[PDB]
Amino acid sequence: NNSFITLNPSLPNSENSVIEAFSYKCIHCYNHHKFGTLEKLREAFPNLHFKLYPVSLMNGEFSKEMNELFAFAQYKDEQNGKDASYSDSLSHKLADVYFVSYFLNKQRNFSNLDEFYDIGLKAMNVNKNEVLNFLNTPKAKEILSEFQRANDIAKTYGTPAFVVNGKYQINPSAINSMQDLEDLVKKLSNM
């Protein structure tokens, strides 16, 4: 069958989930963001959680700081009843501003971190110190550790990469359509 590979070990804190490993510099990731792929999967599968895993080796010079901002967004979205499948989540808004920066606003280079960091902080209506205080917590360090698996996940087939229940990574060649992706997420989430 080869429609998926099994990750070993499983991704932590992944049960009942679809994880999308993505880059803000990837056209395919941008197209899935604009299309609302994760929102559509929530329409089909309201009991699954949807999470973004940024791929730091594809996210350029300020990739570590981008991972920090996504860890904060993931944290805060849990406090607010949202995940990455809601357009008004902090995770979706944060992905949106960086996709807009790169694909609409032609920004490739920043001469220092704070020009880059400020885009994310403005999208989430927070400041650098609020993010720094969150980063200095065991739970933030745990979320950032989880994102380290995104790099090898992305290398297998490219981005985006969809992972079901922390275990089953979908081969992009196995699907043509949104409904093909839904059907495979159903099969894998019921294994």
Residue numbers in the entry: 3 to 193
Manuscript excerpt for this entry:
The bacterial proteins of the Dsb family catalyze the formation of disulfide bridges between cysteine residues that stabilize protein structures and ensure their proper functioning. The solved structures of both CjDsbAs, especially the length and amino acid sequences of their L2 and L3 loops that are essential elements of the monomeric thiol oxidoreductases, were different from that of EcDsbA but similar, though not identical, to that of EcDsbL, which affected their functioning.
In the orthorhombic CjDsbA1, the electron density map allowed for the building of the residue range 5–193. The active site of CjDsbA1 was observed in the reduced form, while the CjDsbA2 formed a clear disulfide bond. This was due to differences in protein purification procedures. CjDsbA1 was purified under reducing conditions. It should be noted that the CjDsbA1 redox potential was the highest among the characterized DsbAs so far described; EcDsbL has a redox potential of −95 mV and N. meningitidis lipoprotein NmDsbA2 has a redox potential of −79 mV. We found that only CjDsbA1 restored E. coli ΔdsbA resistance to cadmium. In contrast, CjDsbA1 complemented a lack of EcDsbA in an EcDsbB-dependent manner. CjDsbA1 in E. coli was partially oxidized, probably due to sulfonic acid, and generated oligomeric forms (resolved by CjDsbB) that are active in disulfide generation.
